[PDB]
Design goal:
- This is part of a larger assembly, with chains A (181 residues) and B (52 residues).
- Chain A contains five helices and five strands; from the N terminus they run H-H-E-E-E-E-E-H-H-H.
- Chain A is an alpha+beta fold and 181 residues long.
- In chain A, the strands form two sheets. Chain A has a three-stranded antiparallel sheet, covered by helices on one side. Chain A has a two-stranded antiparallel sheet with strand order 3-4.
- In chain A, a hairpin with a 2-residue loop joins strand 3 and strand 4.
- The longest helix of chain A has 24 residues, at 141-164.
- Chain A starts with a helix and ends with a helix.
- Chain B has 52 residues and is mainly alpha-helical.
- Classes of the chains: A alpha+beta (181), B mainly alpha (52).
- The chains hardly touch.
Chain lengths: 181, 52
């Protein structure tokens, strides 16, 4: 699928698309670099495929808590700011790396470009193609059309995300429903 | 419980009104008709006064 997106970017530039994987003379490496950067930037915000560390009780001797290597962003479930330093959990407001109690944090991980939903992959590929076209061939009507296509794919991705996470009204109406029964 | 409480109030009011109409307070709900057979039988009841 990665070669397919590289070919998408090559087509956006008007060049002949490739078949062999990463063994091409033309500057298609910029396409791969832009694709990786765009994928990381887009996945930085929380989507419906992101993990959670419900409880990680640290051992008192080292005091440090390991975090997933492929993490992108972390949000503490409680009121604490968290981040990564040297691959372990870090307290931003306290500037310390040690922890004595359990931590409940929500962490956003990174996904390989062959392992993510079709809509998000197409959005990333089209955004990379638009960025590469803007860098190389300038900002003309083709760039605007590519931006519109990327926006449409982003809208489809948002539709899928809203479908997977049923964001109905079930937060304060629970009290009324409990009162009715 | 249902999402609306109007029906409960309506049924309570209807019940009160119907029960009051069927069993009025201070007024008996049935009248003996004036018949000789009733007149002959009411005497053997231990109640003084006229037949009415």
């Amino acid at each position: 699928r990665l070669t397919d997106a590289v070919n998408v970017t090559l087509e956006a530039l008007g060049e002949s698309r490739i078949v062999d994987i990463n063994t091409s003379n033309p500057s298609a490496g910029l396409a791969r670099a832009a694709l990786d950067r765009t994928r990381r930037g887009v996945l930085s915000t929380g989507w419906w495929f992101n993990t959670i560390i419900r409880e990680v009780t640290p051992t008192p001797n080292p005091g440090q808590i390991k975090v997933p290597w492929n993490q992108l962003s972390m949000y503490g479930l409680d009121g604490t700011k968290y981040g990564e330093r040297d691959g372990v959990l870090y307290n931003l407001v306290d500037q310390t790396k040690v922890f004595s109690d359990t931590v409940h944090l929500k962490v956003v991980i990174d996904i390989d470009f062959e392992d993510l939903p079709e809509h998000m992959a197409m959005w990333v590929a089209n955004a990379t193609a638009a960025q590469v076209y803007l860098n190389d061939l300038g900002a003309d009507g083709n760039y605007k059309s590519l931006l519109g296509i990327a926006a449409e794919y982003e809208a489809m991705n948002m539709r899928e995300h809203l479908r997977n996470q049923r964001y109905s009204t079930s937060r304060t109406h629970a009290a009324r429903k409990i009162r009715s029964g | 419980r249902d999402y609306q409480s109007t029906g409960a109030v309506l049924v309570n009011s209807a019940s009160t009104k119907v029960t009051n109409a069927l069993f009025p307070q201070g007024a008996p709900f049935f009248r003996f008709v004036d018949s000789p057979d009733m007149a002959a039988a009411v005497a053997e009841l231990g109640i003084n006064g006229t037949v009415q």
